[PDB]
C-alpha cells in the first residue's frame, strides 16, 4: 500500500506563513519527482510546483513564484511546500502527487488526500440564523417550503440539519458564498407538506464547530 | 504559458449513451514518441484519479468504457456507454512543458427530462432588520437543465451587482438542481422601496414566472 499523507494546513491571515508536509510511505520516494497541486473551493486544479528526484531541478508556477518554495528531505521521504506571504486567493486544498509515473511500460499515479489552507483576515465568528418563511398563500398549493439563512460566519464549515437530522427528504443546503466582508453566507431550505405544519414544528440545526456555537431556529410561516 | 481548453464545459449524458470530451492545447504536446497529456476524473470530495495517460493509454484498473485519442494539440476522451459511476468532472493536463496547466474541467451531468422550478420568495426576517441589513432570497427548487435566469426588480427596477446566486449539485435521487439567489440591501435602502420581485426564466417554463411581495403585507 502506497500512501501520501498531507499535513500542515489550516487557517492563517494574509501575509502569514504555513509549511505543508507530505510523508510518503511504501514507495521509493528518492527515485521520483513530486508535485504540489491546489484547488480553490469549487474551482479547478492548478499546478503549483515540481521538484525532481535529483533535487537540483525544481520549478514553481508563476502565480506562486517567489512566495512558495518546494523542497524535499530524502532522508525522511517527505515533500514540503513553504508558503510565505500568503494571499486570500491561496485558499485551496493542496495535494501532493507524483503525477504520471511511466516505467517498465506501465502507467501508475499516486495522489494524497489533500489538506485545506484557508487564508483570511477575518476573526472567527459563529453564524446568525434568520428564518426564511413562506407566505401563507405559497403554502396552499399542497407543498410549502421554508428554510434558514446562515449569515456572517467564519471559517467554513457550518452544518445544517432539520429537526436534529431526522428530516432529510427535500432538503437542499446551498454552497456557502464568501461575502465582501470576508464572511460566508448560505441558506438551507426544505419543502414540507402544509398539513403537518400545524401538527408539528420544523427547526433548523446550525452547527459551527470553529466557534463552538449551535443554533436551533424554528421556521414557520406568517 | 500553455492554455488547455476543454470542451464542452458541461456534458449532460443519459446512462448508456456515449460521451465525448475534447482537450485543446495552444502548443504541441509531443516529446519523443509520446504525447504528454493525461486525463483525470475527480468525484466530489475525492482526489483526482488517473484515467488515460500519454494521450491514448488506459490506466490500470480503468474500465473499457474509457479510451483516449489525439495528437499534437487536439485530444479526445471517449466513453462508449456511460454508467452511473462515471459522473464527475474530467480534467486534462499537459506535462510536456512547465508550467504544467490543467483544463477548466468538464462536468459530466445526468441527462434527465426537463423539469420546471418551483419558485418561492422570502422577505427579510424581522430579526435581521434589527442588524441593519436586509436579505431577500429567491428559491428555484428541483429543476433541469441547469441554465436559468434570475432577475431582481425593486419597484420595477432591475438590480445589478447586489445579488449572489448559489446552485446545489445534481440531487442523487432525482438528478435535479436547486438554486438560491440572495439580494442584500441595507435596512435603510430596503425600507425606501415597497415591491420586491424575482423573475425566473427557465426552459421548463413556457413564460417567465414572477413571485413578489410588499413590505408589511
Amino acid at each position: 500500500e502506497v500512501q501520501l499523507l498531507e499535513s500542515g494546513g489550516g487557517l492563517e491571515q494574509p501575509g502569514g506563513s504555513l509549511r505543508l508536509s507530505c510523508v510518503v510511505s511504501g514507495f521509493t520516494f528518492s527515485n521520483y519527482a513530486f508535485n504540489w497541486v491546489r484547488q480553490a473551493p469549487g474551482k479547478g486544479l492548478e499546478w503549483v510546483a515540481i521538484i525532481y528526484r535529483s533535487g537540483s531541478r525544481m520549478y514553481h508556477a508563476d502565480s506562486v513564484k517567489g512566495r512558495f518554495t518546494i523542497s524535499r528531505d530524502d532522508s525522511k521521504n517527505t515533500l514540503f511546500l513553504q508558503m510565505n506571504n500568503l494571499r486570500a486567493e491561496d485558499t485551496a486544498v493542496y495535494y501532493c502527487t507524483t503525477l504520471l509515473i511511466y516505467e517498465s511500460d506501465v502507467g501508475v499515479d499516486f495522489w494524497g488526500q489533500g489538506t485545506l489552507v484557508t487564508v483570511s483576515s477575518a476573526s472567527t465568528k459563529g453564524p446568525s440564523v434568520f428564518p426564511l418563511a413562506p407566505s401563507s398563500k405559497s403554502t396552499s398549493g399542497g407543498t410549502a417550503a421554508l428554510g434558514c439563512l446562515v449569515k456572517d460566519y467564519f471559517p467554513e464549515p457550518v452544518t445544517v440539519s432539520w429537526n436534529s437530522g431526522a428530516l432529510t427528504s427535500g432538503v437542499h443546503t446551498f454552497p456557502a458564498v464568501l461575502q465582501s466582508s470576508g464572511l460566508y453566507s448560505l441558506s438551507s431550505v426544505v419543502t414540507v407538506p402544509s398539513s403537518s405544519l400545524g401538527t408539528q414544528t420544523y427547526i433548523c440545526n446550525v452547527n459551527h464547530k470553529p466557534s463552538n456555537t449551535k443554533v436551533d431556529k424554528k421556521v414557520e410561516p406568517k | 504559458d500553455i492554455v488547455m481548453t476543454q470542451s464542452p464545459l458541461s456534458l449532460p449524458v443519459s446512462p448508456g449513451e456515449p460521451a465525448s470530451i475534447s482537450c485543446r492545447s495552444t502548443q504541441s504536446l509531443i516529446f519523443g514518441e509520446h504525447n504528454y497529456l493525461d486525463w483525470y476524473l475527480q468525484k466530489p470530495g475525492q482526489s483526482p484519479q488517473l484515467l488515460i495517460y500519454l494521450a491514448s493509454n488506459r490506466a490500470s484498473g480503468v474500465p473499457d468504457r474509457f479510451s483516449g485519442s489525439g495528437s499534437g494539440t487536439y485530444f479526445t476522451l471517449k466513453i462508449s456507454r456511460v454508467e452511473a459511476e462515471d459522473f464527475g468532472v474530467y480534467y486534462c493536463v499537459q506535462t510536456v512543458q512547465v508550467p504544467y496547466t490543467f483544463g477548466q474541467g468538464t462536468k459530466l451531468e445526468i441527462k434527465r427530462t426537463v423539469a420546471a422550478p418551483s419558485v418561492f420568495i422570502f422577505p427579510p426576517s424581522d430579526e435581521q432588520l434589527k442588524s441593519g441589513t436586509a436579505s431577500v432570497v429567491c428559491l428555484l427548487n428541483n429543476f433541469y437543465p441547469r441554465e436559468a435566469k434570475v432577475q431582481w426588480k425593486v419597484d420595477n427596477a432591475l438590480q445589478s451587482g447586489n445579488s449572489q446566486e448559489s446552485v446545489t449539485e445534481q440531487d442523487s435521487k432525482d438528478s435535479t438542481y436547486s438554486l438560491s439567489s440572495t439580494l442584500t440591501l441595507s435596512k435603510a435602502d430596503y425600507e425606501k422601496h415597497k415591491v420586491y420581485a424575482c423573475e425566473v426564466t427557465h426552459q421548463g417554463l413556457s413564460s417567465p414566472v414572477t413571485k413578489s411581495f410588499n413590505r408589511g403585507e
Partner: peptide
C-alpha cells in the same frame, strides 16, 4: 517534460 514519464 514529466521526469516520472521517462523521456
Amino acid at each position: 517534460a514529466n521526469p516520472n514519464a521517462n523521456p
